[PDB]
Design a protein around this ligand. Sequence first.
Ligand code: 7TV
Ligand code: B7G
Length: 255
Amino acid sequence: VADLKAFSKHIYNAYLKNFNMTKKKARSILTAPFVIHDIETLWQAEKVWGLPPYKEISVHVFYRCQCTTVETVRELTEFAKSIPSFSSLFLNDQVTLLKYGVHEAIFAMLASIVNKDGLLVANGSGFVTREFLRSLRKPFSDIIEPKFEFAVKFNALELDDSDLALFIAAIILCGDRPGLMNVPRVEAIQDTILRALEFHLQANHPDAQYLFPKLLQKMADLRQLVTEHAQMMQRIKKTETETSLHPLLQEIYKD
Ligand SMILES: O=C(O)CCCCCOc1ccccc1CN(C(=O)c1ccc(-c2ccco2)cc1)C1CCCC1
Ligand SMILES: CCCCCCCO[C@@H]1O[C@H](CO)[C@@H](O)[C@H](O)[C@H]1O
């Protein structure tokens, strides 16, 4: 309880140092950004704002998701490396962790910039509506909406940034990942983060009953969210041959 408090402080600093936007700053903005809600406003935003050559509205928007997804893998990688227990693993295990962990963490973190009406883009200087993203053609509308369903429920838990750092540290440092070399070591670290999380919630959310087991179920739900995301990504790679898929995301899905 004493030790695990110090542990959590370090993981929080890892978080504050590496992530380009806190949930704190996102809610404050979300409560002014340029609203993108149709083709004209997307154009004006671009003309708020170097991607692959143009194809069409839905694909262009998918290119922008893809670029932000890659940018977030970057942050998550620096954040992981800022955790001494992560950085102490052999480099191959770090890659295995990030490979199977980042999309779960990405979708967890995504909730911070989402409300029921849309999400922030371009570092908070823009806001893209959910109805606009719903209007894109299949399969680009289908891959977007489920993340929204997840976020609004997740945001009802009202985690702050110090909760999120442990929660995401817990997602990354997961002994379950296929092809781990040193499983007992990663399981041990995961257990520690989870114990630290449990205590942290006790102090930070003293009136929130069931919050810890609530968040453990969200980790199980994120796992299913990502399975469905990869399946949709398989369909896009198969039916949308003219859409470019970033090589880094390719190396992640190839598993
Ligand atoms: O999986 C992969 O690796 C392949 C990529 C598919 C990812 C599916 O993308 C989704 C789905 C749901 C919610 C958000 C996003 C994309 N994101 C955005 O922040 C974002 C960025 C730009 C726009 C935009 C600009 C102009 C008009 O719209 C809109 C949203 C999040 C997601 C996680 C990191 C970023
Ligand atoms: C930047 C952090 C995220 C990295 C995620 C990408 C991991 O890709 C994997 O890299 C391995 C070599 O390291 C290959 O042996 C695997 O075939 C490949 O799937």
